[PDB]
Design a protein around this ligand. Structure first.
Ligand code: IUN
Ligand code: ZN
Length: 87
């Protein structure tokens, strides 16, 4: 129910934070932002606007939605978008 970062509630706002995303990181800002993540501005650290979970060390082939569900399966934004079955 409760949203940790209301300023990062829209995907456009989240996508804006990836302005200085390192291009050597092999995961795309558009998929990070769509999966609820915004960039904290250092290294490849991101957080989810809803559950406040953090993820780093993004690997080639990582799916932000799958990684979101692996580590933060009770995130209400995750469940709302992808369904309880996905988690
Ligand atoms: C391989 N695929 C990627 C997506 C993945 O699974 N990574 C994992 C991950 O990130 N995990 C696991 C759950 C918590 C979160 C972390 N959180 C932290 C922060 O300290 C932190 C603090 C603030 C932030 F904004 C971001 C992060 C450090 S480990 C780890 C996989 C092993 C190697 C280390 C990273
Ligand atoms: Zn979340």
């Amino acid at each position: 129910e409760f949203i940790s970062n209301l300023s990062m509630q829209t995907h456009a706002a989240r996508m804006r934070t990836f302005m200085y995303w390192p291009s050597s990181v092999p995961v795309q800002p558009e998929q990070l932002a769509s999966a609820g993540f915004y960039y904290v501005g250092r290294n490849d650290d991101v957080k989810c606007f809803c559950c406040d979970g953090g993820l780093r060390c993004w690997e080639s082939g990582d799916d932000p939605w799958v990684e979101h569900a692996k580590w933060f399966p009770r995130c209400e934004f995750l469940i709302r978008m992808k369904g309880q079955e996905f988690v």
